[PDB]
Design a protein around this ligand. Structure first.
Ligand code: NI
Length: 341
């Protein structure tokens, strides 16, 4: 059944709750972003109101074929009324179109649901600065102190320098980047840019990217693989077998592959710096795992919560085991005592 942490008290609202059939008493279904564990269950047959960002609305229409009359996009950073309740959508710093949702309850309670987010100090100067938030439904993906990672900026610098050096040394090298969802577009766009190439991809992926309102996108991507030296492939194919196979397909236009796998966290983060990363190599193929995250580090999450000073925290990630629940609740109390709220 629909879990309590997907329900907004005092409303008929649910968040990211599309796989339970009809939720008894739900008058509006919000969708934070277009990732499959969140939209799971939506289709052309859905006949309730869906509230979301413009970009998420483009993806629902074009990729899932949800009918237009049930899609209600809202602009960001704007006070809106939905079934008699004031809401605001804020940028979540996750994937394109991803939002956090502020609900202003008739009784005076204010609730923030983060969806999936990467906490940033820039959020401290949004509409969140303007009033008190009583309850926080929090993206706790990496809520443990072992989870450190570099800035997105540091990671992109590393990838750009690496790719540029490789291709300038060998003009017959191919660069490949893995993907399995929206998000992390900076990785492959920044590399294609330093190399003066467009990124080549399947028709399905090109369609997905054309929904995202990225400026000048027609200048940066293409379905013509042969004219491109940065290819995108399914993440599943980013391994030595899948890459040798792929290399055959290019007809001796290339003799070397340099491939990037943008992972979340991986335990080499507890030892190694970004400057010190190395690839796995077999033959003329090298694969780099780069820790490009679109979720908060432990320290980023801690800072955001200690700034906001909520009265109650409701985790939305890692809630399935008692040991994870109990560990998270321990960090929350530490944070509150350290900061004095
Ligand atoms: Ni997500």
């Amino acid at each position: 059944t629909c879990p309590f942490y997907k329900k907004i008290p005092g409303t008929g609202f649910t968040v990211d709750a599309f796989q339970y059939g009809v939720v008894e008493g739900c008058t509006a279904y919000f969708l934070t972003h277009f990732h499959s564990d969140h939209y799971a269950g939506l289709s052309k047959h859905f006949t309730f109101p869906v509230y979301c960002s413009e970009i998420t609305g483009n993806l629902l229409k074009n990729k899932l074929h949800v009918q237009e009359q049930y899609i209600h996009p809202l602009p960001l950073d704007t006070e809106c009324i939905v079934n008699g309740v004031k809401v605001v959508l804020l940028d979540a710093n996750h994937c394109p179109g991803a939002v956090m949702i502020l609900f202003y309850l008739p009784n005076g309670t204010v609730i923030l649901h983060t969806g999936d987010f990467r906490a940033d100090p820039s959020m401290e100067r949004s509409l969140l600065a303007d009033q008190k938030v009583h309850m926080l439904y929090l993206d706790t993906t990496y809520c443990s102190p072992e989870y450190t990672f570099p800035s997105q900026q540091e990671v992109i610098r590393f990838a750009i320098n690496t790719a540029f050096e490789a291709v300038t040394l060998n003009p017959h090298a191919l660069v490949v980047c893995g993907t399995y969802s929206i998000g992390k577009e900076k990785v492959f766009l920044a590399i294609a840019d330093v190399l003066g190439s467009k990124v080549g991809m399947s028709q399905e992926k090109y369609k997905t990217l054309q929904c995202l309102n990225i400026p000048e996108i027609n200048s940066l991507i293409t379905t013509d693989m042969c004219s491109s030296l940065v290819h995108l492939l399914p993440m599943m194919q980013i391994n030595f077998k899948g890459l040798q196979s792929h290399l055959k397909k290019c007809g001796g236009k290339y003799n070397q592959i340099l491939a990037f796998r943008p992972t979340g966290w991986t335990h080499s983060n507890k030892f190694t710096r970004i400057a010190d990363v190395i690839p796995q190599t077999k033959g003329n193929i090298s694969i780099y795992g780069i820790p490009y995250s679109e979720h908060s580090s432990y320290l980023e999450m801690k800072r955001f919560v200690q700034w906001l000073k909520p009265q109650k925290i409701i985790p939305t990630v890692n809630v399935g085991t008692w040991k994870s629940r109990s560990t998270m609740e321990k960090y929350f109390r530490e944070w509150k005592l350290e900061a004095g709220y």
